[PDB]
User: What shape does this take?
Amino acid sequence: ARARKGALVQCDPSIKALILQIDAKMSDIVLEELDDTHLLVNPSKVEFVKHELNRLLSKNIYNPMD
Amino acid sequence: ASLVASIVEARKKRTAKKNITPYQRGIIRSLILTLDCSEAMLEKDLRPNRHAMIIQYAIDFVHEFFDQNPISQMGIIIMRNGLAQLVSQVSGNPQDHIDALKSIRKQEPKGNPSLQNALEMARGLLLPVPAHCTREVLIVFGSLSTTDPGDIHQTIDSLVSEKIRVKVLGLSAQVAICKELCKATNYGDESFYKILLDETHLKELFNEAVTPLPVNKINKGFTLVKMGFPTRIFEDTPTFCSCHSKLVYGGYFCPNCHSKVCSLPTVCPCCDLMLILSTHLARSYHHLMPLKTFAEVPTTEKFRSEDCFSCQSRFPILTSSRYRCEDCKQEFCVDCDVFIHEILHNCPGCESKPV
Amino acid sequence: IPADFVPDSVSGMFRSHDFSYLRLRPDHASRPLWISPSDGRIILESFSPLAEQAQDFLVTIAEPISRPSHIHEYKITAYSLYAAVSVGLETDDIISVLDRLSKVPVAESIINFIKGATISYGKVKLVIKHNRYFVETTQADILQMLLNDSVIGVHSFEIANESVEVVKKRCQEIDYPVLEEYDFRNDHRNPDLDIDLKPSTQIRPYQEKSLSKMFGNGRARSGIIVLPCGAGKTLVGITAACTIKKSVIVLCTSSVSVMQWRQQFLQWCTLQPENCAVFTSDNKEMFQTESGLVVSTYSMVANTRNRSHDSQKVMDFLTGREWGFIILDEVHVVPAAMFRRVVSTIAAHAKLGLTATLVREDDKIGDLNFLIGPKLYEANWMELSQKGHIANVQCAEVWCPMTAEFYQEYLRETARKRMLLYIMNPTKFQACQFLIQYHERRGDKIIVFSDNVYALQEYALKMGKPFIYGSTPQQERMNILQNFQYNDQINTIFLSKVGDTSIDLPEATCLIQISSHYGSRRQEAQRLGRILRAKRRNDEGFNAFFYSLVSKDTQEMYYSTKRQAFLVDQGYAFKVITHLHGMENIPNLAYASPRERRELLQEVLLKN
Amino acid sequence: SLKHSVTQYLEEIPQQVQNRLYTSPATCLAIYRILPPLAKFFIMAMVFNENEVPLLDLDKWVNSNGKLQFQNAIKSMKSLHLLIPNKSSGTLMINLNPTFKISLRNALTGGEVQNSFGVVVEENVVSLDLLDEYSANKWETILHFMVGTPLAKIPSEKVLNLLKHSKLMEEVNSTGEFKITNEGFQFLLQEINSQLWTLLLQYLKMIETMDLVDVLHFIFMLGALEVGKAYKILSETQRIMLQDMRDYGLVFQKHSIFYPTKLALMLTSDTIPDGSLIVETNFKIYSYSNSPLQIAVLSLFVHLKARFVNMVLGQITRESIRRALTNGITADQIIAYLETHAHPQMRRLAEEKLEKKLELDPNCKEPLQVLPPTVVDQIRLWQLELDRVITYEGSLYSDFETSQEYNLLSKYAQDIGVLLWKDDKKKKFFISKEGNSQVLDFAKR
Ligand SMILES: [Mg+2]
Ligand SMILES: [Zn+2]
Ligand SMILES: [Zn+2]
Ligand SMILES: [Zn+2]
Ligand SMILES: [Zn+2]
Assistant: This one.
C-alpha cells in the first residue's frame, strides 16, 4: 500500500542497464525497477537523465562523419 | 535534318498503303490461336521472357478480337512437352479463355513442339464448323525445328482441301517449313509468315492480326444466314437460365422459342439460332466502308485554309501539314487525320457536305 | 568570381559555396561541365553531350570524388595533372578544352593550379646500366639544380638504390619528377626475352587503353594501373611483358598468388616453364637461361630471420639480374616498411602497379608516386559493372536486433573481449541459419566471413560444415575448398582474412558477413571484390547478394558504416534491413531457447 | 481539413448569425462552392421551386450505395443551419434556408446582387506589371520573413502581433526572434490557399467587435473578386481591414481605387516536373526545381552546394536532419515534404518493385513505405531513431486491486480525454495534470 511520486518511463533491458550505470556514477535518482519495460525515476532529474542518456548513445555512435 | 528522314520514312510507309481496296472480307470468323509453351520461350532474352509477353499479348489479342469481331468463336490449344493440349474450346464468352490463359500464366512453359499434332487436333476441333465461318489459325512459334510423329505434307494437303488458312508469327527467324505452310495454304502468298524485330513490332503484328482478312473470288460461298434479334427483359423475380441453369434477375428472351439466356452475341441453346444486336453487325461497317487516305497539300502552293477544318487549330508552318479529304475537299491536321482514320469512321467534312 | 557577387541572404551557410556569380553560358545545354573553385571540385552532367569525349579527359586530368548515375563529382588535383602530363598533356591544352566544354567561365585559381602543375617532362630521366641506377638527364641544367640540392651526393651519374627512393620523393617535392620510360627496343644491354603475343590472347578495349596510355611513345611508362576485380590485370601484364620482350619479375603477396600467376603466365604467354623458376620453401630452383623469370612472394626477399643458403643463392641471382620490367601486383602492401626494399634490392627498369583498391589507412599509397609512379590508367567501376566486366550486386545489410541475453554481459565485458562477446549473438545465429536455408533454397553457394577463428569454427560447427582461416594449413584448406567446390556435402564454407583477398573464388554469388575488422575498409572492399569477379556477371536478371550480420546497440553500426562508405561512394549501396524474412518459419533455430542462449553465453564466458 | 475547419467554424457560428451570413449572394456563392457535390445538387435543384420536400422523397431518390456520403452532406446541411428540417405531419419536412435560397437564386439569375459581387469602378489596368509584381514582392518579403533568412521589409505590426500571440513562427520575446515552430513548419508545408485560410481563420478568431459578420461577408466577396480592376472603397470596418490586407500585399490599392492581385484568385480556388526531386542513397539532391525561396527553405534541413537554373544540387546530412529535428519540426513533416517532392522515374521504379513483390507475398516481410526504402527508409530509420522513447512525467497512480476498478477509472479518463498511458498487465495508468482533479473526484464517487 504505497504511492510514491515518480516518473514512469517505458524502457528496455539494455537501455535500463544504461540507467543502472547512470545510477552507478550518481545513484539514488532512479527510484525502482518495475519490469523490463518500466522504471520509476526522480521527477526532478528526468531530463537530466534524458540528456545524460543522449550523451550515452552519443558515446555509442556520435555520428561524427568529419 | 530529322524532318527529311521522317518525310522519306512516311513516303516509304505510304507507298504500301497507296492501294486501298473494298475487298470482300470475312465477318463470320473462326480464329484459333495455338500456343507453344516450350523451352525456347523460357529465354529471358526479351524482357521479361517470351512466355510472359506472349501471355500479355494474347490477353490483349483476345480483348481486341472480341471487341472488333464479336461474331466469332475463339479456341486455344497449348503445346507442351511433345503434346498439344486443348485448354479453350471455341466459345462466345472471351472470359472463359481469359481464365484459361490465367491458368496458363502460373504454369511453366517447357518441352518441344509438334506442329503436326497441334495442327491435326486444330483441324479436328475445326471440323464441326458451318460453311460461312472462315476457319483460320494464328500460330506462334519460337523453335527453329519441329519434332513430329509423321508427315506434315499430308496434313498440309488436308488443310488446303478443307479450306482453312494459317498465319505464322515466328519468333527468331524464318523457318522454311513454316514458309511452305504459309505459301501453300495461302494461295502462294508470302504475306503470312511474319517475323518480329522487337516487342513493339510484335504489338503491331498482333494488332494487324486482329483485323479481318479478305476472301477470294474463287472461294465463293455467297449465301444467306438465318438471324434473330432477341428481346431483353428486366424482371422482378430471379429466373432460371437455360444455359447455366441458375436464377437470373434479368436476361434476354428468345425470339423464337421464348427461352432465356444470359449473354449476347450468342446462339440459342434451345431453338439453336444465333442472337445478336444491330450494333454488333454494324460494328464492322468501317471494314465494309473503308476510308480514303488524306493528302497533305504542298507547302509551295496556295492554301484553301490555314487552320484545321475539324479540330479547329492553326496549321503549323517548312512543310504543310494539311491532310486533305478529297471526298470532302477539306484539309485537316495530323491529329484529326489519325483520329478519323483510326478511331472515328466518318468524315465530318463529308457529313457537312451535302450529296 | 566573374561578378560583384553581393552576398545573398540564402548564402550564409554557402561559405563561398553560392556558385551563381558565374555568368552561365547559353551553351549550358550542350556543355557538361561545371567548376567548383571553392574546393577545386568539378560537377559533371550524365545527360548532356560532349561527356563521352570529356570522360577520359576528366579521368586523366582530374580525380572523381563521387560518381552516381546522374552527376559525377570530379576534382582536378596536382597528382592528376602530373598524371596527365606524364601520359602527355599540357596546361594550355587542358585550359582550352576546359573552356571549350565548360558551361561556366574558367576560374582563376584553377587556371593557376593547372599552370603550376606542369612538370619538366623529359628533363629528368634515369636509366640502369649493368645494375647501375644512372641518373641520365638531358642537360647539365638539371645537374646544377640537383647538385644545388643537398640530398644528392646526356650526362649520367650514380644514385644509390636506397637513395633512389629518397631522391625520387625529394624531386617530387621540388616538383622535378622523373619519368621512367624504358627504351627496351633501343636498350639491348639487358637480355631480350623471346616471348611473343600469342594469337590466343586478344585484349579488352579498356585494357588496350591502359596499355596505350603507357605505350604512347612505344616505351614502357612506369606507374600504377588500377583496375577492378577480375578485369584481366594478369592479361595486361602478360601483354606488357610480351611487347617488352625482356627479363621481367612480378611479385604478389601470396604463395597461392605465386602459384596461380605462374600458371597464368605460362598459359597466356609464350614463356616456357623452363624459363620460369618458382621460388618458395616448396622449391628454390633457378633458370639458367639468359632470359626468363623467377617468381616469389614478397616474403622470400623481405625475410632475414630464418633463411636458407639456397634462398640466399636465389636472392643473389635476382640481385645479379638487371631486369627490364617489374610489376608489384596487389601494390597496397609493398609500401610497408619491411616491403619497400624493392628499389634497394631488385634492378628493374619499368615499374608498373596493378591492384584493385588504391586506398589504405595511411598515406603510403601516395608513396607509389616516388616508388613506381602515378596512376597510368583506371577503369570506371560502375561503367564496367554495366558493361558486365564486373558484377552487379544487390547488397543487403542486415541490422540484427541485439539480444539483451548477450548485451547484459557485453556492456560489462572488458574491451578486448566485448568484440568476441557481441559477435556471437544467438539471434545472429538464428538469422544466419535461416539465411543459409533460404539461399540453399534459392541454390546459391554461400561463403561466411568472420574475423575470429573461434567464432568462425563455432558457426561452422553449428552449421555442420567446415571452416578455413589463416591458421588452417594449406593442404587442409585446399581439401576443404575442393570439397566445397565439387562435393555436394559441403554446400557452404566459413572463410576469413585468407578469403577476403588474393584468391580466385568467384562461384559464391551469395555472401554473408558475420564479422569483419574494426575499421579496415580495404578488407570489406576486397570481400566485395571476391564476388564482383563472379562468372555470372553477364547474364540477364543477375544481382549478386551480399549480407552483413551486424549486432545492434553497439558501435558496430558506425563501424560498418565506416567500412561501407567507400563502396557506397563507389556506387555499391548498403540497404537497410532490420526485420528479416522467415524469422519463425524456420523450425529449428541455432540457440533458440533462452537456456541455449545462456549455454552459449557461458560457453563464450569461458574465453571472455 | 480546410473545408472542415471553415464548416466547423460556421457551425460554431450560431443559427441566426449563419442566416445573416446567408443573406448576401456573394457569400452564398462562396458557401455553395464550399458544399460537397450531393448537397450542391440538392440546393441547385430546390432553389428554383418553392416546394419544400419531405426527407422520404430525397431518401427514395438517393441510391443507397453512397448513403454514408449522403449522410455527411445532410449532416453538414443541418449543422450549418442551412436546413430547417422539422417533423411536419410526422415527416421530417426538409426546408433550405430561405435567405440563402433567394440570394443564390439572385446570384444565379444575375438579379439583385446589391454589388455583393463588388462595388465596381471597372477601371481595368495591367496586373502582371503592377499588381502581380507588387504582390510577388510583398509575398516574397513575408515568405522569407517566415523562412528566417534575413530580409529588411518586415511585415505589418498587426500580423506581427498575430504571430507574436499565435503559435505560428514564434516571435520568442526572450530571444526577440521569430522562431520556427512545428506549427510554423506545418504552415510552411501548407498549400497557399491553406495558408491564406489559416491566416484568415486565425485573424477572425482573434478579431472581435469590428463586426464579425462584416469581416465574414467582406472575406467572402474578396474571395469572389476578380483581378485587375478598380473598385469603390462599403462598410468602414471592411475598408480598414481592406487596408490591412492591402499592407499584406493582397490588393494593390492607390490609397480610393484598389486593384486586387492574383492572390484573391488563388484564395478563391487553385488556379519530370518542377518540385520533383530525385532521391539518392548517397543523399544527393537532384531537384528539378529552383528558387531563392526553395534554397531558403532547403537551408533549414538540407546541406546544399550551389544554385543553377533548375538543377539545385546538394547532399542531405545527418547534421541537416538533426537540425530539422531539434527545431521541433516533425519527421512526419519532413517526409510530408519529401513525399510531396518525388520524381517520375523513381516512383515508376518503386511501383514496379511493388508490383513485383505483390505476387511473391502480400506482406513481403518488408516495412510499409512506398517511397524507395534504399533512400527513403534511411530517413525513416533516422526518424524512428530520432524519437525512440516515451516519457511520462508528473503524477502516477499505482497498485490497483480490482481490475474492475482499474478499468473503470482508466476508461473514465479516456472518455474525458485525460489519459496518457495505461498497462493492463501492471494495472497502472498515467493521466494529465489537468484531468487529475476530475479523475480523483470520480474515484471517490
Ligand atoms: Mg579466410
Ligand atoms: Zn445462364
Ligand atoms: Zn430459342
Ligand atoms: Zn485537327
Ligand atoms: Zn471528307
